[PDB]
Design a protein around this ligand. Structure first.
Ligand SMILES: CC(C)c1c(CC2CCCCC2)n(COCc2ccccc2)c(=O)n(O)c1=O
Ligand SMILES: [Mg+2]
Lengths: 405, 555
């Protein structure tokens, strides 16, 4: 019942962020939810003296037919004080399930100097009413300080389960609990539900989301294996190798661009000389080796680039320095979005963010192949994670598109 | 009959700053006479109070004679305290748009004048509202006052007032959901679909409910009768519009004529269909000096005449019906200009609007159409809480070809083709693979950074060549110029090979119109073509063709 001394960063003020417009269906759901939350004291109405505001909206889960309130605490997170060395074993795991233990936060009350900074607004259609304002009394789902404060109060709940299973890795990030065990699914499903009645003993706590870090998309860069090479094939190849030379050292393209000597038709077949095939093979060997001196620095930002490859395919690379990829991958399994580009890009951003949380314990900043105004209008309609990453936009077509497929 | 106290709002100053101390100005003898009569009166009403010598804060007060009233009027210069008062969540950050209202049988205005001064002020904040009335001949201590209610012209008075009024109106709204209420400034707008008899009783029910807090309403059948004039609009029982839009017709148009013609026709474009302002707003771009006169172009005067004929007749919009579908229809007007009408039943506009392309070197019709849709979509979430169905001048196969091939993700909500020309189309489309049996042009260009001299040309697999020398050019112009020559001197199908990452970036963006004189010529060439495959190779690697023409143009 006693609070924790929370404070912002030096010189920074609370967030003043405009609420963006919401559809009628979402306004209605936020009202129903915030009424039940008000009766339970988790939130209380506020007046005009509170000038701070953080956006709010509503989402539907993958299969939960009940809405959920999602507060965009990104601005407050940038302004909340810094308060766990990330479990580097979680990524080596074979199966990981993620649970929303967000309800657990609503039992610890929040520092009363800090509550004014958690202000949000339910808006009205056409501004025919003033917005219903609340501020949080308990810990808020989405705020950086919620897992930090609660982890002293959360280690105790699961140490009987940790005592029973030293094999199982458990990692906490925001309102999500990542639970990992290297065993068959039948044991998993009951072990995960066993982990709930152990959590139900004290206090949407029922959903399950299943990942497989071991069998994940991790890729190299590959050159084609052809028998007859056109001028165009060898040209694309020299372009790929020229771009890979910024990444790997011993890449050579001289004996290959030697074949391009002359002004032949793009569709004309060029037999490869042996100096050329020696060069192409040595480059192929080089590319299978990893990038040299590539390391993760927790002080720096993780950057993620996504390219649209067509036919529901998407390539991405996570890095901190240009040409020092910490991870690359490809996606073609974009769910239920076969005629919507923005739904695919939204689902890909969440998958990449999820993979980034497992590996490094924090989320990347995205460079999205989409125009600012299209993304900002629609990403909330398909967003299903309880966290939100940062993003910027690329307006010039990168030539790296077909280098990665 | 006892009244309820209105809960006060705890106010503080911006942290780090203190209250205001600016000096009291010298007033004429008659001005001092008036302020004493007003402030003596207001003290009787409980709105202000005398204070002692301890309070060191001072806000200056003036006296303004009314136009034809011999009743003076007080005025406190709260500008200094407003710089020091904290920030509030202004609940007026958005006003409704007439197109989103639901048609009501009856609508009554209620004027809440003295309600503003019925609202208490936080006790611990009253110290900063202090002000002095300078005495006659500066021979006594100027009598000192402080406010006990929300003062006129104070930063936080609008916010605290509307939040208190909202708190009081919520029980009424709850216990009769057949009545909607809107509050702005000093006015209450109250309406319903009730039998006009029951409506007035519920008005009285509200007026008595207001006195429960000691709030006074206009007893009289009020003089404000439709049309309600409000925030530049005119609102009638079955239709709305803007307060009249008549154009200044002049021969000499200054710079403070154009910037204010900007603000007006934009305001008028929400209901007046088809208003354009591209060439006219394009005049302002340069200077801030507020007196210059400009000659318009022959496309800015020809556009203004197409305005006036839209504005000869009054136009009106319909109110919103939640059970009929919502529809938006867009038309291209040329020169990066678009107009849209939003309606539910054909020819009955809820509202209209325009969209102008953003500033950029190269552009595309399809992207502009997409941008316009997002603007209408966001605008419709605000006013109606839903996305309209779109009727767009673009065919389903054009859009499908576009978004499946474009390098960015893009999306339009539910829409259908409407055959109202000019139609948005794809003017050209590049190949994914090299074309068999098509001549292959290796192009290159190069310029001398000093003399601005350069060459541009091509070599092909059929031995065809060209090199052209140029003056006052850059590397990027010659790389474009070379591609232009290959398009000029080739058949209906052509394979182009280039090393210009800059040129590829422009053409892979698929522009159909450009500010660059040279890019437009290339677009015109691509339109004539049947199949064009554009291929990229890295420079200075000795790629044949590229190596040969690079040497010819660098020489
Ligand atoms: C009661 C209100 C929300 C309302 C109005 C009032 C407007 C006045 C200006 C600011 C925004 C609210 N109006 C406009 O009045 C037209 C009218 C209707 C019936 C009788 C007399 C006048 C509306 O039209 N609806 O539907 C309405 O529902
Ligand atoms: Mg060159």
């Amino acid at each position: 019942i006693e609070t924790v001394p929370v404070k912002l960063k030096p010189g920074m003020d609370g967030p003043k962020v405009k609420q963006w417009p919401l559809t009628e269906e979402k306004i209605k759901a936020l009202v129903e939810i915030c009424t039940e939350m008000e009766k339970e004291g988790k939130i209380s109405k506020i007046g005009p003296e509170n000038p701070y505001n953080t956006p709010v909206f509503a989402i539907k889960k993958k299969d939960s037919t009940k809405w959920r309130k999602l507060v965009d605490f990104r601005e407050l997170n940038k302004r909340t004080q810094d308060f766990i060395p990330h479990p580097a074993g979680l990524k080596k795991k074979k199966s990981v399930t993620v649970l929303d233990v967000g309800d657990a936060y609503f039992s610890v009350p929040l520092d009363e100097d800090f509550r004014k900074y958690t202000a949000f607004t339910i808006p009205s259609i056409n501004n025919e009413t003033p917005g219903i304002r609340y501020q949080y009394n308990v810990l808020p789902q989405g705020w950086k300080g919620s897992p930090a404060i609660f982890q002293s109060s959360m280690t105790k709940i699961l140490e009987p389960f940790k005592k029973q299973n030293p094999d199982i890795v458990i990692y906490q990030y925001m309102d999500d609990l990542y639970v990992g065990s290297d065993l068959e699914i039948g044991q998993h499903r009951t072990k995960i539900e066993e982990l709930r009645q152990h959590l139900l003993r004290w206090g949407f706590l029922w959903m399950g989301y299943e990942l497989h870090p071991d069998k994940w998309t991790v890729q190299p860069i590959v050159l084609p294996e052809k028998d007859s090479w056109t001028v165009n094939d060898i040209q694309k190849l020299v372009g790929k190798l020229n771009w890979a030379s910024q990444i790997y050292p011993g890449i050579k393209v001289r004996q290959l661009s030697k074949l391009l000597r002359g002004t032949k038709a793009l569709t004309e077949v060029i037999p490869l000389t042996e100096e050329a095939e020696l060069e192409l093979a040595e480059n192929r060997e080089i590319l299978k080796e990893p990038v040299h001196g590539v390391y993760y620095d927790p002080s720096k930002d993780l950057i993620a680039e996504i390219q649209k490859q067509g036919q529901g395919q998407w390539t991405y690379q996570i890095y901190q320095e240009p040409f020092k990829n910490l991870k690359t991958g490809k996606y073609a399994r974009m769910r239920g979005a076969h005629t919507n580009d923005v739904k695919q890009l939204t689902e890909a951003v969440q998958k990449i963010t999820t993979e980034s949380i497992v590996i490094w314990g924090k989320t990347p900043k995205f460079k999205l192949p989409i125009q600012k105004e299209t993304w900002e209008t629609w990403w909330t309609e398909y967003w299903q994670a309880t966290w939100i990453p940062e993003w910027e936009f690329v307006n010039t077509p990168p030539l790296v598109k077909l280098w990665y497929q | 009959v006892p009244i309820s106290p209105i809960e006060t709002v705890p106010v503080k100053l911006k942290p780090g700053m203190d209250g205001p101390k600016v000096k009291q100005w010298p007033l004429t003898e008659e001005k001092i006479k008036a302020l004493v009569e007003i402030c003596t009166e207001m003290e009787k009403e409980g709105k202000i109070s005398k204070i002692g010598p301890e309070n060191p804060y001072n806000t200056p007060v003036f006296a303004i004679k009314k136009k034809d009233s011999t009743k003076w009027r007080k005025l406190v210069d709260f500008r200094e305290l407003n710089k020091r008062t904290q920030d509030f969540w202004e609940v007026q950050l958005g006003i409704p748009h007439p197109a989103g209202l639901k048609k009501k049988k009856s609508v009554t205005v209620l004027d809440v004048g003295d309600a503003y001064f019925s609202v208490p002020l936080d006790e611990d904040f009253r110290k900063y509202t202090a002000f002095t009335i300078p005495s006659i001949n500066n021979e006594t201590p100027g009598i000192r006052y402080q406010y006990n209610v929300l003062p006129q012209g104070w930063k936080g008075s609008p916010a605290i007032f509307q939040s208190s009024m909202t708190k009081i109106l919520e029980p009424f709204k709850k216990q009769n959901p057949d009545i909607v209420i809107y509050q702005y400034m000093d006015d209450l707008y109250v309406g319903s679909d009730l039998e006009i008899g029951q409506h007035r009783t519920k008005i009285e029910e509200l007026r008595q409910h207001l006195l429960r807090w000691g709030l006074t309403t206009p007893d009289k059948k009020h003089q404000k009768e439709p049309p309600f004039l409000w925030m530049g609009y005119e609102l009638h029982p079955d239709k709305w519009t803007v307060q009249p839009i008549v154009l200044p017709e002049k021969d000499s148009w200054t710079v403070n004529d154009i910037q204010k013609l900007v603000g007006k026709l934009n305001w008028a474009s929400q209901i007046y269909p088809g208003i354009k302002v591209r060439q006219l707003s394009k005049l302002l771009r340069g200077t801030k000096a507020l007196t210059e006169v400009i000659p318009l172009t022959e496309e800015a005067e020809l556009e203004l005449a197409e305005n006036r004929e839209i504005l000869k007749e009054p136009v009106h919009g319909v109110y919103y019906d939640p059970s009929k579908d919502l529809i938006a229809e867009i038309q291209k007007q040329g020169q990066g200009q678009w107009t849209y009408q939003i309606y539910q039943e054909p020819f009955k506009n809820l509202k209209t609007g325009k969209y102008a392309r953003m500033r950029g070197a190269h552009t595309n019709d399809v992207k502009q159409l997409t941008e316009a849709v997002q603007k209408i979509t966001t605008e419709s979430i605000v006013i109606w809480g839903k996305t309209p169905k779109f009727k767009l001048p673009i065919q389903k196969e054009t859009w499908e070809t576009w978004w499946t091939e474009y390098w960015q993700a893009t999306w339009i909500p539910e829409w259908e083709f409407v055959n109202t020309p000019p139609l948005v189309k794809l003017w050209y489309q590049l190949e994914k693979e090299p074309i068999v049996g098509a001549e292959t042009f290796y192009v290159d260009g190069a310029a001398n950074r000093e003399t601005k001299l350069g060459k541009a040309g091509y070599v092909t697999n059929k031995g065809r060549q060209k090199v052209v020398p140029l003056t006052n050019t850059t590397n990027q112009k010659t790389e474009l110029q070379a591609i232009y020559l290959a398009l000029q001197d080739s058949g209906l199908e052509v394979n182009i090979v280039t090393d210009s990452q800059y040129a590829l970036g422009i053409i892979q963006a698929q522009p159909d119109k450009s500010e660059s004189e040279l890019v437009n010529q290339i677009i015109e060439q691509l339109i004539k073509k049947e199949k064009v495959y554009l291929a990229w190779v890295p420079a200075h690697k000795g790629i044949g063709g590229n190596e040969q023409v690079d040497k010819l143009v660098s020489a």
